[PDB]
Design a protein around this ligand. Sequence first.
Ligand SMILES: CCCCCCCCCCCCCCCC(=O)O
Lengths: 43, 50, 178
Amino acid sequence: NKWWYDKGECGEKTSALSLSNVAGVFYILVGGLGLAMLVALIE
Amino acid sequence: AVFDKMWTYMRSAEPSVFVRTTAEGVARVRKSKGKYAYLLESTMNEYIEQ
Amino acid sequence: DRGVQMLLTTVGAFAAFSLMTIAVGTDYWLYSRGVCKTKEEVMTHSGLWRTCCLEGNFKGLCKQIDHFPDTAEYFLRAVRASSIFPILSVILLFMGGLCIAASEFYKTRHNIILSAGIFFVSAGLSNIIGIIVYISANAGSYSYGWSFYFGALSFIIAEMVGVLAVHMFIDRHKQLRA
Ligand SMILES: CCCCCCCCCCCCCCCC(=O)O
């Protein structure tokens, strides 16, 4: 224990939520806007 | 256990945790935001706190 | 009035196209702290294509960003590499400009103004996708430079000009039916 651990060199706040873990919903949003425009133009 | 472990850490610390004077120790614990703590005599500690 | 509306649409289209073209060619997108030239970390420019250095021992040196130093990540890496969406935004703005120019000549068609509107709106959507892709690609301190905000201002102006075009087409068809 002494030489492997007693000499052991070894054994945080929530971060704001980044554009990377809601990016998918943005992609879906813009895709849906494109689809809506396409449908309107077809009609 | 506890005090010996603290000693082993302090000897095995880089940069240097130790200081040469009480005044610089207090100055350092102030300098580090909360990254330094100083172990010293209770009476002196209370006086410095006041 | 029709004259003022057309002038404002044309000026807006030109401004949006100029802004996006400047942004997609200039280098001041991301004031990060990276490496000017490798194979000591300092401030950088880090545009869309070349990451010029700054404030270092040697300034002004630029090297093409090391795209491609997980297929889900691979596709995003590819899309940022080409910057298809910013470029596609620029192309769509140019095509909308062509439509608006053809508005005055060969007029009374009434469907080229609608085309201009659709192109401007699509250019805005392309621009927003491009911004999201770019910001996502750089999640692996910093700040955003004036070229990034040029892209953003381009998006807003493109959307306003698209609204103008669609409203102008509606007014044209309202006049025609009376
Ligand atoms: C629904 C309309 C709401 C519009 C809200 C407008 C608020 C604009 C404030 C801009 C703050 C930008 C801070 C810059 C940060 C940086 O990049 O260093």
